[PDB]
Amino acid sequence: APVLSKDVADIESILALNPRTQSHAALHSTLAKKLDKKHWKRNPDKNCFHCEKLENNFDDIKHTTLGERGALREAMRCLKCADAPCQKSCPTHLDIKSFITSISNKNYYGAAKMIFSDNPLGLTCGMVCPTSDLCVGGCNLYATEEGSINIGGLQQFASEVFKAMNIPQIRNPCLPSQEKMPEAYSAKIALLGAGPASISCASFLARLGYSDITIFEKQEYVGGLSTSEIPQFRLPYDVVNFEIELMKDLGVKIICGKSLSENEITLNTLKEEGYKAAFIGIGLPEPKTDDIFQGLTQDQGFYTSKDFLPLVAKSSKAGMCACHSPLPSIRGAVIVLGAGDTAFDCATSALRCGARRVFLVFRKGFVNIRAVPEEVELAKEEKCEFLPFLSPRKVIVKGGRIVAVQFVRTEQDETGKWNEDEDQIVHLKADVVISAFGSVLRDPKVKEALSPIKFNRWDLPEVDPETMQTSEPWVFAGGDIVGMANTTVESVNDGKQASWYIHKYIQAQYGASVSAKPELPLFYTPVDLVDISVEMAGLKFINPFGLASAAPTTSSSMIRRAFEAGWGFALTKTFSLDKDIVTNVSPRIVRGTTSGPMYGPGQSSFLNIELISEKTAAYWCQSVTELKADFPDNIVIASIMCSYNKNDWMELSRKAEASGADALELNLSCPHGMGERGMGLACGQDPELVRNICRWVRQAVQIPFFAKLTPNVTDIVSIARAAKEGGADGVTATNTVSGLMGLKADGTPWPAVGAGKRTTYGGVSGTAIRPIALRAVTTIARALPGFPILATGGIDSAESGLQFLHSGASVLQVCSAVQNQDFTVIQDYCTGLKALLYLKSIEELQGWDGQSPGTESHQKGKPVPRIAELMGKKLPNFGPYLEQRKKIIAEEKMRLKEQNAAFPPLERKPFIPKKPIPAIKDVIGKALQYLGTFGELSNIEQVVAVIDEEMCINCGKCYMTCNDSGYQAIQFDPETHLPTVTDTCTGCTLCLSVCPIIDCIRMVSRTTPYEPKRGLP
Amino acid sequence: APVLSKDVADIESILALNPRTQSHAALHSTLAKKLDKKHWKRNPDKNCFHCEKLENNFDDIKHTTLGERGALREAMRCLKCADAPCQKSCPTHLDIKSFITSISNKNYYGAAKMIFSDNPLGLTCGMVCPTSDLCVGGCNLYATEEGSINIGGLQQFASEVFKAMNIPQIRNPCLPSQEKMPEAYSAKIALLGAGPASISCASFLARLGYSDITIFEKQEYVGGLSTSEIPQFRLPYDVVNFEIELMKDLGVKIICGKSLSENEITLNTLKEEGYKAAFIGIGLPEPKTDDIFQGLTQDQGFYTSKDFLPLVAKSSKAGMCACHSPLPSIRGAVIVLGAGDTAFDCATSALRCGARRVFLVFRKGFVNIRAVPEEVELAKEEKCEFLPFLSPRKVIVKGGRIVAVQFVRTEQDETGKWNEDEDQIVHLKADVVISAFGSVLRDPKVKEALSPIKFNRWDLPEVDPETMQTSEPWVFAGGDIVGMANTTVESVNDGKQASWYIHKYIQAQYGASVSAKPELPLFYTPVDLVDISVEMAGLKFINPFGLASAAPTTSSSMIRRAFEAGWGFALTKTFSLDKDIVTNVSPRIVRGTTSGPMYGPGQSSFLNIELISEKTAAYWCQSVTELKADFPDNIVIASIMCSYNKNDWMELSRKAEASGADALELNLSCPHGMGERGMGLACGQDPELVRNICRWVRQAVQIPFFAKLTPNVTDIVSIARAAKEGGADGVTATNTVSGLMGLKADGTPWPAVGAGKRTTYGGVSGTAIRPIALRAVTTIARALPGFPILATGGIDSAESGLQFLHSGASVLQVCSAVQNQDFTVIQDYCTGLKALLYLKSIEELQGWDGQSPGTESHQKGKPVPRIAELMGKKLPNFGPYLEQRKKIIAEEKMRLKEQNAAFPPLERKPFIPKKPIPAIKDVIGKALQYLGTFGELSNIEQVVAVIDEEMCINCGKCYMTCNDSGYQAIQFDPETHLPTVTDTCTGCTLCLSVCPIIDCIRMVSRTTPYEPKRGL
Ligand code: SF4
């Protein structure tokens, strides 16, 4: 019979590309290499000077866009810094540390809530903020080779998920009922212009309780420049609509077709009409012009950015207008004049209109470009040509058309000044000219409508930079109109700033005072109303999260701050009688090596050789009395430990109870009387000793007490049962896992103590032991139904916490997650749990896994075009294949231009719960139904792996894993590097487990014949 | 008595910047924000158009340079792809997957060996390769938001560590002795030009065994352009010297002051002198010139790149020449003509010479720039101005000096045919002009010296692109001179390619044939000679690494491939008697959630609910016979399992022994009993059962057998002892840890089987259980001294393997690391272990931790200036402080300039072992001496944390950890964001444990009185 230990021809063939170490250096000529290189090319080719067709292509071109896989990686990378410089560098002071922490914990709702609390246009800003000159410019990670965090992309991601949840914004909960609001809040308020500034101002005023807010917008569309000029390929119109609807949820009214102008709305007519306050947020409505372009028409080929961008927007943004607008026909060479964002967006937009070539002409040098590198990069990658040091002089017009523009040289002298060299000219051929010099306010009728407010030397409304108030106390202004900044986030901040002082002004007008300290409300939704309280062992917890007896509870002052932060409960560090006083050694707590040489945030574990508290029982008991007196609703559990002695346990437990502790937690780590039978060395490892100790405490106190169990036992259920039989009211599962974190190359340990560099076995904590704790909790919950369990072991998010609740635990203890961060994580845990419970009531989101939307086919986090001429073509994203994909996509865009259609918009409508929102008590133990013996698992219902070609990044890991750890069932194409799972798959699932792309590989029910490989008959 | 649970004023103050969730939105005016922004600025300011002083500043400006912290992070990120496109895109075909895998496993030696095996100028290339147009351009991770891997930087890092090791290259080991080499290998070989091409060619010929190789170099310095023109701030000269010395270790001779030219050395004089083969690697020695610059002199301010760059290099590269020379005095505005690497290096170099302003003028557009984007980036960040579409027409000279250059406008038309517009001119003011159009071969005397080889239409030596052979069979050529490529790596490849055919030619001349298949040797050093064999339980292992009984040993055909790859031993997947046949379910193996939502390479654990082998005992026994017959030196251990039955264990053990297995491994996972006698349900959890099973097997077979222990017990020592008492020859520690990996938000498990979505407890494997396995191994080793232990549990590198050996294990079993990669990791483990053992004999490297050099103060992996005017200044790397640091550094550079001195690179000298290189038997159990009870630990010898301000990146994590998990002992400055550990520190070590910068925080002996805090 055949050589069993040898691969047959077929398998040898399938293993052709499997890694094998070479015994010699490789020989490939330089010429051969030059040729082969093209086949695998991923990035832009430096030698290719021809741009990829972009006519009618408005697909997202942002390099910062992130999908869930990418967002989680970047969020975990963030150091989540104290007094973070990125936040200091953000105009709206977003708590970046907190929102990124939430994203890293998969709590997208909490992240979005944090974002929108300080920036009502959070999604728009995540997408368009020039971060390199703002938040990212101050990021501490810039000091590392890998670089600064993609803050904008993370903000965009969390906000997009929230948008997908279709949850509405709600009125401030702690606010009195609409009917009980003081009359001052009904004051008629008017805002002019529906752009970022007014949207923000109106939003914050509405949060404060004002019920009569109206925004008067000149145009038929809303959103300001975010709608009329920023390209669809950078800022999708549906984003703007989303943020507007959120504002409308607060009652803000918007009336379009109304202009602030002398023969229409004026400050005088508003005051006559009874308006108490007004906010001017009309931006800079007119284009900066140059005398040389006077008289030129669009038919001749001349446009100002104010003419051009809105035309492209109306045509590419579904919804914006009621009438379908044609895409401007831009053919030939295009000259764009300007060096700011306007110019770059005109250049890129011109390509979508069919431009053959685009020239960006600056009057200064490259170094003087105004737009941030990120913006410049977009025009650069699309092959726009940059021409520096040129100033326009004349537009040659022949046959009623622009045929060229004549320029003159410019240069900086010996002081810095700029001059024009007349004898040095340039005759640049062009068919279209677009001036993108900027914008201004110059309509006399508009300025007159603002009488009698004072205008500064820049001929713009003068305002106090702190209050945003004009010379007229009831009139405020912000955004581009003030002329201080030119970004969406700064305009949003102006409205935010103004809202507080408008509030102060109105209240004063009604004879009411306001807090000296500004107090703008946060952002709220129905999720915030979800009840996450839970009752266990007769105790009421405001929320299920608490601090475990550990380093974070080293001092009672820390517990105090934890309760102030919002933690539901806390354990004191374990303490004992005076005679059992201990002294710690140092070093004693080290990082885990459980996930490789990854330093900084998110350590996968810690190992400690710390003893019980070094502080006295007297200190802890007085501390408990103090804590319970000041925080009656927060549960305080005293952790205590004694040697195996009845009088001692009774004495200490009674002392703790007398201090006012809500309950006790018995630390069973103390060694016994003389080893002997293999029940370890600690009392907690022997059922008999545990039972006795619990009996002693039960007899001594009347308050509930829980036995903290060690996972270092053969059968933890035996110990849990012993504690129950002893009288314990529940058990804490579990303590740390015994281990050695590692040795240095010289053999010395870490931690290493004293001159002798000695160590002893320590306790492992963190996410690395979560599988062990989860097993412990579930096994105890199944063996002792209804017996209270306090879970501990790797809990670092609402999601992981919910896993333990589902496993049978009632409350959740945390240590390592706090050591990795700080007490503020409680805010993430609470909003996260509320969101998870809330989402369970939304029928239309059942396909989601918690807060994670179903994974859709993507590449780099961008939706893969579902084009018939692409699905099933085996065209990977590299080399000649990518060229083909681009050609196909370009053809589709042209077809879409032909086959016209565009008005099936989405009347945004919030999802409404269709079943009661589950309370904590309703989810406890729900996972137990799926757990059982191996025999209870079906060996008939087998699965096989299936790969989504469109999501694949061609690494071949699935292939390598099946080859050297599986069944050699995957074919890896030598040309496309695309994997195909064959019929020999056994569904072991290893490939799916090593794939870098989330959900690229999925396990599906086997449809073909199934037979175990016995290797022989 | 005070309120004990409240922070006193002092502590409230220290906690000032500690994170606290806000209950309201913040109010900060736009004006206030604009002002505050500058204080924290890290990156370049878009509105600042003035460049940082760079006169005489040759500090490394590469954005790709990596320090160990950064290199480990990037290496772990690499997907380590199959048939990798990056390698396909590398001109020298470097096995990137393997060298990066080695870096990820901290095996820098293995990584360097891999790099140099295919590229003898590996360090130079890591630093200068235009990767985006090469290897990186084909990287699969470009398909992710985070982007492609920094391959060049990783190559640079590994090569730099190897350089620091001061290990010499040695002659290929498996080559006959010098004396026994055929006469053909003594053939006189000549190479012209000591640049990358010839260095590579000479190196490979030397590896093949040729003993008379001489490189004739025209100049007094060696290295070619790497030395004469590439700037010191991109390629340090010591790198070039390092690679040249490695080549010289192979016997290659270099003679300077010798030129290929008529009247000097010619192909005819060489042939006449007895040379059998010649390689031409003289590059393109002359500058491409323009008629309009004829007659202009350096005194007037005109230079060609060939004049200028070497002048700067000779002045900034210590060791290049022997004469100390001043830097060229470049003052005023500088005009650099060109759009390739040459032009950009001239521009950046001009700034070091004192240039006030630099203009890069291109004949074409910005889109037509020849240099890759990172090269262009360097000039751009230093504020060089780019002027496109200009062609030089005249140079204006007044008072003996250039004052301006007049250009005419250029433009492309319908036929790409670039035209020049005469009526459109530019009068650009300038004091210095540097032409950087490129290079060529124009010396008639040099071309004559190459007679009679054929020259092509480009007037360059014509060569066959595959063999590198010229029209004369004994003459070959490569590098810039062939005119096909313009990169160091391609020039290196040309020499590599040529070496094989030169070898083929010479051998044929001596009447000898060569293999049809090219066989260039790998790179070797003394480390490769280190013996890593080990004997255990009477068995000899060629190396201590083996495959555990698991998924990687699902089929014997897989074990065969593992042995072919080099694995020392392997366990069969556990098998049993026919009556105990099992059937697996699916899904059954899932990724661990032990390190968060991190997917792809390096999963920290796996959970499986797989059963024993589904293949029959008949299959496994025949397979063992086949494997042992084909691989007699590779150890094969048969893993078997039976229910608690004497006859069964004896029958199966004898069946396995009869098949020829070297030993047996008893899988004790089979259930027995009810389940509350406090010893679980598996036989392996009960000492009595284990002792009886071992007794049965010992009585049945003569070969050694080991009991595989489960870590899921209260006292694993009791089980180990029971196995020993039963007759086992050792124990395998340990099997998987029982657990539940997690649940989805809806409560369903993963793995989930059937429509019922059911699951059962599985076994956790991988790095996440290493602490448990290491504890188990150490405990058994201390309780049962000398009892053989086969370790298993998270072993994924030579370094982790050595930890287990130090802990008492003799051999190392692996599963998860292979599931995370493939069988080739064995190559990394073996070279890594050899290196770790070798380094223990090097006295001058005692300060290193294994292969990791002692950590030096750095920022972004670059050395921090050990300047007096900088130390203790509390100047962080941001805002106005950074501005300050730049001013101080610039002043230091100017000071160093005035003191025209220094030059002692103290010739490179290999370190020599000063003690015997440890064998595996010499390190086993060495760490046990440090293990003991808690009471044996000194509570008198306490430590405190100390922070190196220069390495800090100001995140405040140390501060937050001490505040909410410590003793509130760190002050975090509100302006500089610099932390300071105060006297209240207790040395808990949490801050050091969460700091993102390796070795920024260190624990040092406490010098002040220690008093435990008692709460009062
Ligand atoms: S954790 Fe480390 S890099 Fe961060 S502020 Fe503390 S010493 Fe600096």
b/e burial code for range A316-338 (CB count within 10 A of at least 16 → b) = bbbbbbeeebebbebebbbbbbb
| Chain-chain contact of B1015 with A588 (C-beta, under 8 angstroms) | no
Q: DSSP letters of A304-354?
A: EHHHHHHHHHHHHSSSSSSS--PPP---SEEEEE-SSHHHHHHHHHHHHTT
- Enumerate residues 980 to 999 of chain A having a beta carbon within 8 A of any beta carbon in chain B: 986-990, 992-998
Tokens of B629: 């017959």
| Chain-chain contact of B591 with A993 (C-beta, under 8 angstroms) | yes
Q: Tell me if residue B321 falls in helix, strand or coil.
A: strand
Alpha helices in B556-686 (DSSP H): 556-565, 617-630, 646-658
Which of B17, B611, B931 has its CB closest to that of A759? B931
- In chain A, what residues touch B957 (CB-CB under 8 Å)? 79-82, 600-601
Domains of chain A: 1-25+933-1017 (3.30.70.20), 26-182 (1.10.1060.10), 183-286+440-531 (3.50.50.60), 287-439 (3.50.50.60), 532-843 (3.20.20.70)
| Residues near B846 by beta carbon (within 8 Å), at least 6 away in sequence | none
Distance from Cα A847 to the centre of ligand 1, integer Å: 42
The CA-based diameter of chain A, rounded to the nearest angstrom, is 110
Q: Is the CB of B992 under 6 A from ligand 1?
A: no
Note whether B774 contacts A: Cβ–Cβ < 8 A: yes
Distance from CA of B901 to the nearest CA of A (A): 33
Instruction: Return d(Cα B194, Cα B853) in angstroms, integer.
Output: 32
Note whether B858 contacts A: Cβ–Cβ < 8 A: no
Query: CB atoms < 10 A from the CB of A674, how many?
Result: 6
Tokens of A151: 């803050």
Note whether B599 contacts A: Cβ–Cβ < 8 A: yes
Q: Is the CB of B862 under 6 A from ligand 1?
A: no
Instruction: Return d(Cα A110, Cα A94) in angstroms, integer.
Output: 13
Instruction: Return d(Cα B567, Cα A627) in angstroms, integer.
Output: 61
E strand segments, B641-696: 663-667
Kindly tell me the burial class for residue B799, based on how many C-beta atoms sit within 10 Å of its own C-beta (0-12, 13-18, 19 or more).
buried
A176 backbone dihedrals φ, ψ, rounded to 5°: -65, 160
Contact between B364 and B388 (Cβ < 8 Å): yes
- Of A201, A642, A670, A830, the active-site residue reads A670
Among candidate residues A321, A213, A193, the one with its CA nearest the CA of residue A259? A193
**Residue carrying the six token digits 């399992």:** B641
Distance from CA of A908 to the nearest CA of B (A): 27
Which residue's alpha carbon is nearest to atom 7 within ligand 1?
A: B952
Contact between A987 and A969 (Cβ < 8 Å): no
Tokens of B201: 């060619």
Handedness of CA A27, A30, A31, A33 (dihedral sign): positive
**Alpha carbon distance, N-terminus to C-terminus of chain B:** 10
Contact between B51 and B57 (Cβ < 8 Å): no
E strand segments, B171-227: 189-192, 213-217
Tokens of A527: 């999720």
| Chain-chain contact of B740 with A133 (C-beta, under 8 angstroms) | no
Structure determined by: X-ray
Residue A917 is given by DSSP the state P
Name the residue in chain B with its Cα closest to that of A599. B996
Which residue's alpha carbon is nearest to atom 1 within ligand 1?
A: B995
- Enumerate residues 338 to 377 of chain B having a beta carbon within 8 A of any beta carbon in chain A: 365-368, 372-373
Instruction: Return d(Cα A322, Cα A314) in angstroms, integer.
Output: 9
Among candidate residues B696, B793, B812, the one with its CA nearest the CA of residue B735? B793
A278 is in an annotated binding site: no
Question: Which H helix or E strand runs over B791?
Answer: strand B789-792
- Enumerate residues 411 to 470 of chain B having a beta carbon within 8 A of any beta carbon in chain A: 421, 423-427, 465-466, 468
Distance from CA of B564 to the nearest CA of A (A): 9
Tokens of B588: 């059954």
From the centroid of its chain, how far is CA B427? Answer: 50
Q: Is A612 left (phi over 0), alpha (psi -120 to 50) or beta?
A: beta
Which of B630, B760, B943 has its CB closest to that of A933? B760
b/e burial code for range A796-806 (CB count within 10 A of at least 16 → b) = bbbbbbbbbbb
- In chain A, what residues touch B111 (CB-CB under 8 Å)? none
- In chain A, what residues touch B490 (CB-CB under 8 Å)? 30, 33
Distance from CA of A495 to the nearest CA of B (A): 10
Note whether A11 contacts B: Cβ–Cβ < 8 A: yes
Contact between A1005 and A960 (Cβ < 8 Å): no
Catalytic residue at A174?
no
Query: CB atoms < 10 A from the CB of B61, how many?
Result: 17
- In chain A, what residues touch B961 (CB-CB under 8 Å)? 819-820, 822
A669 is in an annotated binding site: yes
Among candidate residues B85, B136, B91, the one with its CA nearest the CA of residue A955? B85
Handedness of CA A489, A490, A491, A497 (dihedral sign): positive
Instruction: Return d(Cα A703, Cα A539) in angstroms, integer.
Output: 10
Note whether B671 contacts A: Cβ–Cβ < 8 A: no
Residue B722 is given by DSSP the state H
Q: Is the CB of B998 under 6 A from ligand 1?
A: no
Q: What size, in residues, is chain A?
A: 1017
A68 is in an annotated binding site: no
Which residue's alpha carbon is nearest to atom 4 within ligand 1?
A: B955
Instruction: Return d(Cα B305, Cα B437) in angstroms, integer.
Output: 8
Q: Tell me if residue B749 falls in helix, strand or coil.
A: strand
| Chain-chain contact of A596 with B76 (C-beta, under 8 angstroms) | yes
Note whether B713 contacts A: Cβ–Cβ < 8 A: yes
Instruction: Return d(Cα B285, Cα B295) in angstroms, integer.
Output: 20
A346 is in an annotated binding site: no
- Enumerate residues 139 to 158 of chain B having a beta carbon within 8 A of any beta carbon in chain A: 139-146, 148, 150, 153
Residue A825 is given by DSSP the state H
Name the residue in chain A with its Cα closest to that of B985. A586
Among candidate residues B135, B134, B114, B115, the one with its CA nearest the CA of residue B124? B115
B391 backbone dihedrals φ, ψ, rounded to 5°: -125, 130
Task: Tell which atom from ligand 1 comes closest to the C-alpha of B954.
Answer: 5
- In chain A, what residues touch B91 (CB-CB under 8 Å)? 28, 30, 33
Please count the helices (runs of H) and the strands (runs of E) in chain B.
30, 35
